[PDB]
Amino acid sequence: ARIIMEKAVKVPFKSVNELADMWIEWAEMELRNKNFDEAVRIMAKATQAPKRSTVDYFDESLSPQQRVHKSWKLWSFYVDLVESTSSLEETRKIYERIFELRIATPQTVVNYANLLEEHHYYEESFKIYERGLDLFSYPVAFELWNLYLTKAVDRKISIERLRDLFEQAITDCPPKFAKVLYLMYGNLEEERGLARHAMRIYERATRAVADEDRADMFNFYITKSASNFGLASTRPIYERAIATLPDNEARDMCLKFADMEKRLGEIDRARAIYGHASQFCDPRTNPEFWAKWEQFEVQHGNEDTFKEMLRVKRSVQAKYNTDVNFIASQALARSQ
Amino acid sequence: MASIAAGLAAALPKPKYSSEHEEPRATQRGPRIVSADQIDET
Amino acid sequence: KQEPKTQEELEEDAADRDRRERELREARELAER
Amino acid sequence: AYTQVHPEPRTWLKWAKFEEEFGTADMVRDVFQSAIQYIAETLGDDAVDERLFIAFARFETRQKEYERARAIYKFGLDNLPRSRSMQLHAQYTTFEKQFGDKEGVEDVVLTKRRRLYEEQVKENPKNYDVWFDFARLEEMGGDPDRVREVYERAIAQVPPTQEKRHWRRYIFLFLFYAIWEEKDAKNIERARAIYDTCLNLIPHKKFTFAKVWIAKAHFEIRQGNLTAARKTLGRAIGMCPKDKLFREYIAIEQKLYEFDRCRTLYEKHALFNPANCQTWIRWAELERGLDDLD
Amino acid sequence: AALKAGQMQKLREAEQSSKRKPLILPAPQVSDSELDEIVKMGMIGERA
Amino acid sequence: SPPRKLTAEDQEAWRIPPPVSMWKNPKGFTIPLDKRLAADGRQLQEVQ
Amino acid sequence: PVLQHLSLRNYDPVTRGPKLGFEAPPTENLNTLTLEEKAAALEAEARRKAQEEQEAAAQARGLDITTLQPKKPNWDLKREFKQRMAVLDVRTENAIARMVRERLAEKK
Amino acid sequence: KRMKKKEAHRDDTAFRDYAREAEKTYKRQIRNMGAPDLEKYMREKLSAIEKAAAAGTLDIIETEDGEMIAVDKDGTFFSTANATDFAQHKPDKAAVDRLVADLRKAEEASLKRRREKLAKSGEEHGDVTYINEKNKQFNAKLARFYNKYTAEIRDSFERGTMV
């Protein structure tokens, strides 16, 4: 049986999958007639390779004997076998050899870090997460960042160290994940730092989120700033949002700003905000906005401000009295 | 005068992985055609 | 139902445990010296 | 020939990547050493590029020469100006997070965050929360002369505006200098000097701070200076009375279980404001416990 | 019409992103200082 | 000597506007009226 | 014997190959919340509290103090302040205790 | 590496100078030839080895390891620079055909772009503002340059009023 597997290996099979299956058949045979040390040394003979080999696995010009050392079936089998039938240091050496052979996967980064965390090496788990994080660039490093940042916050390492981690993710987060990362940076800053720092983190977040989530991020910033501070301090956030956002977002944020200023009691400031949004908003596509301004003027105002409102309304109608706006308005009217 | 280069070469430890037996990482499809400089060298 | 809080020694890192046992062994060896 | 004509770091790094693919690690090392030496001998020793140092250290990290990589990172950081070794330090921090021991990790994170906060202070000298975070960074680092110098620069950053809304955080910064040189440095005389300088710097004619009065009152209580603590709070009362100040010293004397001095303090609070029903009820309950019912 | 409308609307959006003008707000009659003593009186009343 | 390395911003900074004359039309072109009035600063001119 | 002498972490026995993260992510095997499940809970809580606050004001009519300034200024400052004196308050309490013991023992 | 290459091409689309255009064109032409025939290259190398050995410019020597080492006495094995016979490489007929077909393909692609741009210029979307084809081209050039400055005047001509 030993020599028959030996010459089975010596056969140049037609596929690296076939040679992989024969090597794991030898290992399964020994494991059946349990010889765990022999099975480990058979897998070592299988996966024997030079230190810095880069043989193409899918190269159908070299021998399968040459290019099964980078087979991921053998290495998965070998690392699980060593994990079950040997110690942490031996399994750790197999994992480092996989990482050196560069067939490592984020699944393997997480498995290696989980093995070290189950053996209660939390700092070594963090080190393995860092190694995977500079091995995979960003859009896979976010999966690693999810797991690593939750585990690091749960482990409660030093606040400057956690701040460094969050800046390290924020360095080249795409906006899609920047929403999540900035939210959790602000959350950590609230629970363990200072709320002024959390507010400036949220301001950078409002600058650096995607265009889909920018109004949502501004609203999150406004709600948390209203909770942690005053509405007079949420005023400049409203001003920046209505200065930077697109048209519909700016209309909605101007309406929220005017409502907040009316609640505070500054009727003239609310009137100015409504005039600004009236400039930006076309009546045949914003009837609810014009109705809201009419409600504000009949709850707070006189007939002079009311005729000023109607003068502004028909001036905006004259401004938007173009062919382009006619196309847009007719399309919206017969789409609604 | 090469103080920073000398300090770098001094501060670096010897490599713990031997490299004296290392062939080039990509082989040249021989035969080797070289010159009288390599006649003098060899 | 109030969950009973079983106080683990707020998890001692195994690297710190290995350093502790190594340094007490080294202190024992210095006592032998 | 290419490095002779275009001796920039770009072309040297292209050669080094070439030799990493098609050569030996000894020739990659020779290319890196030749680049460092050439740019040194031509442009000067401070004009060698952190890109060369980073790429050399990263090649050794790929080779698993972690000691050589650490030596390259350390040498480049020691022999380059910080304004042009920024990215070298960032790469060193990530390297130690990947392979270094824990004490090396907080050492390099301490240096990195120290430099970042130093830049933030250099931009805005009056950012008080930045000062507080760099304060806590130095306290967790544990370098006492550094912490003292940081607090001294923070104190010297005097707010020119006389607004109490900024003086909150500035007096609060004095409170943390006191807490550090009471709980970590254990310098009682220095803490007393902190409180004295704080009393000198507070414009008590406009606004006094019950926070610092309470803090140094309890500090002198911990020290055991009964007469000094009472003298300081009496000076506070004669300077500017405050409802919280009266309430906290009433509570302190209630915990002290004495009777005559707290009776006099209740009389003084009645003289300042007779309408404090809380103090009237508390004095009445204390006399009820004293069983002086008349 | 759809494709000319898409190119059209991108051109109009470039226009409008240039065409925006700032918002001048009136100075609030109740500024942050009197916010501070009104919230001080409010907390004094509710703690009483 | 070796050629100057230019950017697309250099190319844009040296592109030249097509001249529309207020007097001359040698080819008899029909120019849109906004293009005809673009180079006039009398729209710019402010009187106080 | 194979399925009990392998660790079954990277290897998949029913397919005779490596385990794929496309089908079974390790986020399933986690015992905690990821960053996106977390922070999505934060978004949901924020929108819930914002809707609750606006309907509270609308059932009400205008400004109250507890929403004009809901948390006291420098509250993080004072929180981290008493967190740093979570110990010296105990030491000055013991100072008052021993000082009371001293004065009462001198009187007795 | 792929995505950084794609991003670099996207950033390098716009014209900077003719040195960049020449470098881009050369790199694209190398890609379009594709992988060289290393077997034919090696056959030519061995034929040149035996021919230069016969002509006495190559020495076949054996060192202490007993291996074939060829030594170019001059430096003209690999390059026809410094070769006095550099002007008698008559290229293969297949090579000439391949170069000619490359140039014919370039010519066809340019003519095809000419046809496509003539068709898309002949299409007319919206108002006629011109009276001939040169006028149409000039008005399109004017729109490309000046429309960022004339938007308010264009709105006035659309709606009928305002500055």
Ligand SMILES: O=P(O)(O)O[C@H]1[C@H](OP(=O)(O)O)[C@H](OP(=O)(O)O)[C@H](OP(=O)(O)O)[C@@H](OP(=O)(O)O)[C@H]1OP(=O)(O)O
């Ligand atoms: O000692 P200060 O720095 O001058 O400020 C205090 C402090 O309140 P703040 O935290 O808002 O600064 C007091 O104590 P706490 O509320 O923190 O417990 C409070 O005392 P009361 O609780 O009795 O209200 C009140 O002092 P007072 O009301 O007697 O003036 C207030 O003073 P100011 O806000 O007016 O400066």
